[PDB]
Design a protein around this ligand. Structure first.
Ligand code: HEC
Ligand code: HEC
Ligand code: HEC
Ligand code: HEC
Lengths: 240, 240
């Protein structure tokens, strides 16, 4: 009936992946027809399962993930690579089970200095080395803008598009490892990245049912936006 | 070949839909197995097309959209309803064409007071009117938290669960209108919502090629985060 689907909800069969292969295809996918972060990462997971094991994986409308490029048509929201990777988890597991998987993928992203991946000369943007940094944000605007600012590189530069291309690979690689670990540990799976400090402490009031201050939703690290930093001071007045 | 898909990229045949139908369906879909905002929205478009026209629409793994519940596994990033609705656009059109569609849907969401949709006695979460407001953000965290704060409503209440359900309906409604208009107008589609003030004013420096300060990526309204409001001041020291 209505709301149901071919194969049932979360009824696809997961298959272990080769993280190295994934990082690679994700990076390549990123440049393909200029589809981007979401497409490359998504494809490196479900796309590779399709090439090796056929249906249902190979029946997916892959380019739909172009939607996530630039945090969804340049709105700079969720980093496309992150969505593309986490979305695949929902093809196999449901809400309760996917939560710790995305928590690990997302918390890892906030703290790890990236990119790590290097295509060598398979580089389609700029060959070379790129500065690494921890974004402390799963949001594209924050991740990209901070890095460009800090490194005096333009968000239009071939470098930042090379950077996002490599990040797609790192996220693909990490997501792949998480999928593998999930297949192994079954319903025992646990995130290896503990809850963020700010999330836990602020959460005491803002994310605890019954609390008079329990208004907030979202477990992104609170630090970037709620720290009174120069960046978050009023830029609409006296801002050269 | 690798990276291609059944039907070619953006190869689906779009069909006009009834906005009021989608709104109703999206609202139901929202509660179905607790799948949420992204599931209802996406389904009310592609799902209905499946029910009414068959393959390929009816072949889609709908439950994957549960990935988006609560701003992606409770992370509070892009609102599930917005992503779910926008995603559908990429099944029929390429990024060039989709950009103005997402721009209108997202801008519409920022400036419009919601929710509008009212299931009356058919409310599946909690019956009754709900306070409306413009979020100024396509991010579930800012949208929800600010609304709970300003109305003193726990983010864990049925009231807010009901609000997000209604919001899903509004989003689905608007996306259908956009899709319909896009079908009629073809390559001449233009968004009714213009670029936000802060984005083009701040963008003059930050999102313009060649300018030293060209570091930012993202066309979200800059006001909530770069205004030095009470909210963005340091909440880590002397708070509350
Ligand atoms: C409970 C002991 C709290 C902790 C821990 C933190 N906050 Fe809080 N916050 C609390 C209350 C009761 C209130 C409202 C009344 C008031 O004191 O003004 C707030 C309000 C906020 C706001 C609103 C804007 C403001 O005026 O400050 C924000 C955006 C907010 N709190 C953020 C926040 C963050 C991110 C925290 C951790 C770093 C944090 N609060 C902890 C109660 C408590
Ligand atoms: C930036 C992307 C943010 C992150 C990460 C977190 N919050 Fe936030 N929060 C942000 C803004 C710009 C706003 C809107 C403020 C406004 O104009 O109303 C909010 C709002 C909240 C609120 C509600 C009170 C309010 O000022 O509206 C709370 C209680 C809050 N945020 C808490 C908070 C905590 C505890 C977070 C970490 C898990 C968190 N926010 C992250 C921007 C951002
Ligand atoms: C050009 C005339 C600009 C306009 C208009 C705005 N910004 Fe800006 N910004 C510009 C420069 C050259 C710099 C360099 C540092 C400085 O203070 O001179 C910046 C920097 C920022 C920053 C980060 C650095 C900081 O002050 O902490 C942010 C967060 C930023 N700008 C945001 C921003 C927004 C939101 C604007 C509109 C309200 C805005 N800027 C306009 C140049 C120009
Ligand atoms: C909140 C959800 C945000 C919105 C909407 C916009 N920006 Fe932003 N911006 C925000 C944060 C938390 C940061 C990181 C600050 C840090 O600690 O480094 C940024 C960063 C930028 C930058 C880079 C410089 C920097 O301070 O790191 C710029 C130039 C900037 N933001 C500009 C800007 C403009 C013009 C926006 C609207 C189109 C905009 N930001 C929205 C948070 C958020």
């Amino acid at each position: 009936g209505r709301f149901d689907q071919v194969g049932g909800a979360f009824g696809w069969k997961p298959h272990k992946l080769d993280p190295k292969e994934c990082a690679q295809v994700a990076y390549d996918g990123y440049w393909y027809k200029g589809f981007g972060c979401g497409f490359g990462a998504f494809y490196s997971i479900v796309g590779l399962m399709g090439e090796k094991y056929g249906a249902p994986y190979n029946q997916f409308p892959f380019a739909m993930l172009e939607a996530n490029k630039g945090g969804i048509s340049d709105w700079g929201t969720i980093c496309g690579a992150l969505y593309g990777a986490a979305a695949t988890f929902s093809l196999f597991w449901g809400r309760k089970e996917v939560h710790p998987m995305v928590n690990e993928l997302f918390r890892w992203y906030e703290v790890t200095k990236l990119p790590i991946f290097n295509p060598g000369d398979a580089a389609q943007g700029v060959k070379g080395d790129l500065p690494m940094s921890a974004s402390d944000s799963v949001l594209c605007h924050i991740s990209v803008s901070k890095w460009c600012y800090e490194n005096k590189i333009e968000a239009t530069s071939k470098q930042r598009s090379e950077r996002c291309g490599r990040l797609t690979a790192d996220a693909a690689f990490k997501a792949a490892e998480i999928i593998n670990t999930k297949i192994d540990q079954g319903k025992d799976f646990k995130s290896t990245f503990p809850m963020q400090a700010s999330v836990s402490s602020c959460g005491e009031c803002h994310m605890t049912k019954g609390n008079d201050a329990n208004w907030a939703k979202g477990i992104m690290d609170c630090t970037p936006c709620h720290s009174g930093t120069a960046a978050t001071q009023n830029k609409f007045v006296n801002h050269p």
